[PDB]
Amino acid sequence: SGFRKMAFPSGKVEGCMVQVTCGTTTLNGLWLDDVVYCPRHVICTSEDMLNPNYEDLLIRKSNHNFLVQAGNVQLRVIGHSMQNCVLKLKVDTANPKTPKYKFVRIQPGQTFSVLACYNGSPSGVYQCAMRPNFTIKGSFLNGSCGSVGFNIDYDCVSFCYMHHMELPTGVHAGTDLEGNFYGPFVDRQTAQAAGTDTTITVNVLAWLYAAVINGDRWFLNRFTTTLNDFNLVAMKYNYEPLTQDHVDILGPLSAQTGIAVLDMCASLKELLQNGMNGRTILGSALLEDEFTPFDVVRQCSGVT
Amino acid sequence: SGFRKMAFPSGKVEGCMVQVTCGTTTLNGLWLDDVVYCPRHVICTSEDMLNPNYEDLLIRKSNHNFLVQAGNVQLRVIGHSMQNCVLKLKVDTANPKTPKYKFVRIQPGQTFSVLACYNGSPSGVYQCAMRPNFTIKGSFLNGSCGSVGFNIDYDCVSFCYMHHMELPTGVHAGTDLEGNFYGPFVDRQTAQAAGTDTTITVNVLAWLYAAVINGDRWFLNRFTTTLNDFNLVAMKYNYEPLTQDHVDILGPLSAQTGIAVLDMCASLKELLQNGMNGRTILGSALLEDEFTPFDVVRQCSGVT
Ligand SMILES: *CC(=O)N1CCN(C(=O)c2ccc(C)cc2)CC1
């Protein structure tokens, strides 16, 4: 019993983190096989960041200008290329600690663990969600860029995020491991405003299911609703619309608890309309939306 | 910028987790040097748990009855002893992945990371606090016992907790790594009620400082108070009394923000008296008390 914001064990990713220095900028790199992945803005002066031409900046850089350090041992860079907003540095040594891995581009609402790193060394791990506006709310200081987000399926690390940017609003933007930004963001120190940060409805429902499983039930009501009726209320409260796909994904939690998805929707509706009245659910006074249905099943079943 | 409930990177601890089986009970063990530490109730039948005499139960057990598996390789048990509520199994192989480590007994209010494990395999990591009533609010299923809590200071893992027990209220009880329970709890399936779960005042203040550092300031007021006046309000709201020791520990956060500790106390006082009025601080609608002053300095400075 008990339900916690739970990150993946980070060890597999800890074994991939390196320091990348180009001139005066030190960032984090991800070492998989004989390739080190890092944000391309490693090549920028602070001045460069205001309006960089990465292709032009990169011409002035050689293999030997990229200083790659894994623990306190230097890696020999034998190649470099730019793919979208990441650099791939080819090194002469396969990372011996390379886990089985994949690069995945996640959808808004999907959760992942971040291994926050500084100078190629892990400081902490926490759980995030890709917001519907393609920002994440992280904990990232200067030097944290190149820190990665990931999921694990038993033995296979799926890398989904690399940290590149803090917006003036102190929310975070980054790329998948092909160097494509989530959302409309660019690796330039220019005013970029985030869109509406809507609540991830399917994640709130999964977390209400988690609450019932863990004994928090005060919010279960006598009502049901329809997808259309629920969606009118969701719109009004800046909740993402719920689709039949979401209902299908919640099926297993519905089955385990015996609470029809649309009944839980009606409970969420009354909570939106009535508030919490000073009460808590799983130690929270607001509706949590950074647990996926899969996250709730995993934590409630004890997958390793 | 951004402030997250952050766990230590778990890799150093992942390398210490083993499976312990005695008869039909499988739990987790911690392998440090040539010793495996596990909850002594590994030797109990479900029947035994109602009123076990551990010394008497242990007489019926030999080295070869303790099945210790690290990954998919069996360890040879060459000795066993009971220390308080833990077993120490001597094995013929030093754990090659043994980190620098210490056993520490933490105080109420202190935070730590839990590596939740099942069958010696990591499922997740999350951040906890020893509650003032010596429970923790964890996420622990059957098979999770022997999972450990820890802090890291650069290279040295300080183990502070081993999981043993869920109370009928679905809160958690365990031991330090000498096998001494936190609080008055016993490893017996009997009614044990937790005391008052008071709010860790010094931790709420540290987190209000973290909020100011991260730009959340709406709650800063025009008022100050005294330790005595603040403490009258704390008592009324089931907050732990604040001592000069707590004020001293908050000194660095006071210095960085330029907000006198007693001014922040007056802000916390108005929040207690007035509530949040539907507003949030660092994405929370209640006052968070599972960040220590040290935790706030660490996360805000990016220690590795
Ligand atoms: C993403 C990241 O970690 N970066 C990029 C932004 N950044 C700076 O431009 C910067 C340069 C120098 C100093 C003192 C602070 C910030 C920090 C690194």
Ligand SMILES: *CC(=O)N1CCN(C(=O)c2ccc(C)cc2)CC1
């Ligand atoms: C602490 C822990 O993980 N335990 C101890 C309590 N426990 C049981 O007694 C138990 C036995 C058998 C079954 C099916 C469930 C629970 C679980 C293990």
